[PDB]
Amino acid sequence: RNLRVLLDTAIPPSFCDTVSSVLLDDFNMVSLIRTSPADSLATIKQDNAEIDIAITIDEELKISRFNQCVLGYTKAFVVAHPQHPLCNASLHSIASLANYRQISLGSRSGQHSNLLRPVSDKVLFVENFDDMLRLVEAGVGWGIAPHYFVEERLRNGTLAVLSELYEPGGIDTKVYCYYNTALESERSFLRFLESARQRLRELG
Amino acid sequence: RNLRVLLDTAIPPSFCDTVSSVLLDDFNMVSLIRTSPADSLATIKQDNAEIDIAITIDEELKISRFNQCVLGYTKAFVVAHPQHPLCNASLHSIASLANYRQISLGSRSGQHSNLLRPVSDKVLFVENFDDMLRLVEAGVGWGIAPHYFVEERLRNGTLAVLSELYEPGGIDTKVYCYYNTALESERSFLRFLESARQRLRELG
Ligand SMILES: CC(C)Oc1ccc(-c2ncc(CNc3ccnc(C(F)(F)F)c3)cn2)cc1Cl
Ligand SMILES: CC(C)Oc1ccc(-c2ncc(CNc3ccnc(C(F)(F)F)c3)cn2)cc1Cl
């Protein structure tokens, strides 16, 4: 039968690399789908999408018709222009960053998870990290981005990090894997889980 | 828009690993499809399948509505049971292997490419390498298989190689990449080509 895997934008692509390497060996067709973390959960719930596996950071225990396991952790950072105001203060709190503009990830349904619910009251919603960064690089605000996006930008100084007194080394965020009940009865999935887990570990 | 990549069974899975790693970065949805090498070409020709990229070993310059490039080489071997008759003779020719039973890959359309057209006159068609090997291990005949299938079997002695005076180190077979004209105008594809090429090289 056909499979349809979903990976949110927070998960780096070299992960879907190793996901498809494994699943094809014991399948016919594997469809990889990318979505904003704000849209990931809402997508699988639609019975119309026939999503069989979802791999995202958003959290929910009330998801129905699916199950839930943990694959590992990804990494995120609070970034802002190097000359952005809050780099002068090595001691900026949540209530201090809530008074500036955040570049959040707006959802296509309007709902906002407790995960990606913006922190600031002055917010400017986007649908993807590429646009979140095009703004943050212009100094329009700050935002929380995956490590793989802000990796190059941080090394060459186009972009600085604000989240080091909060959590040194970046904000670790669980990657979860929702999966439809029927795949419980199958090896390859268990083989995929063990490989996906060892795959997210190697990214540290 | 949506993409649908096709990989034949002769190409190992860790290759579709690196194919999807690259394409997703600059796409929304990538669908990976596995097919017997005998069925690969016939599939893309069907305009009903909406195949956008095909990656197989079968050869044809008259393919219409597509283009054609070369990605690298895979490897194959002529294998047979270790106690199979033709291991006694270190000097078996094509006309000597044509008198025994071959386990070929039959096609769903009946047609047989000049590539996978069986060599022997006594042939037993299968649709996949797993069944080709279940027979060859039983000593029902010999067959031409990809390196990644007969890798473990050869190391632990469950299966021997007959194709070393023909071509030492295994029969190298070009992997090609057929691709629809519209993708000519795009970077990621050129980025995919250069990565897929360096990916098949690393498998040597
Ligand atoms: C420096 C300190 C004073 O400020 C902050 C520290 C931490 C947080 C913070 N909020 C939400 C979460 C939940 N997880 C994510 C939310 C959004 N996106 C992502 C990802 F980028 F991974 F996709 C992950 C994690 N951390 C917010 C602030 Cl403002
Ligand atoms: C030892 C010698 C005396 O015998 C032989 C030597 C070589 C050949 C031979 N024939 C066809 C081709 C074409 N390429 C493939 C055909 C089928 N399958 C595959 C793959 F496995 F890769 F998918 C590749 C290559 N080689 C046949 C014989 Cl009998």
Residue numbers in the entry:
A (entry chain A), B (entry chain A): 93 to 296
Task: Quote the study's own text.
A promising target for QS inhibitors (QSI) in PA is Pseudomonas quinolone signaling receptor (PqsR), also called multiple virulence factor regulator (MvfR). PqsR is a transcriptional regulator that controls the Pseudomonas quinolone signaling (PQS) system and is considered as one of the master regulators of PA virulence. Activation of PqsR by its native agonist PQS leads to the direct and indirect transcriptional modulation of genes responsible for environmental adaptation, virulence factor expression, iron acquisition, redox signaling, antibiotic tolerance, cytotoxicity, and immune modulation/evasion. Herein, this work reports the rational design, optimization, and in‐depth profiling of a new class of Pseudomonas quinolone signaling receptor (PqsR) inverse agonists.
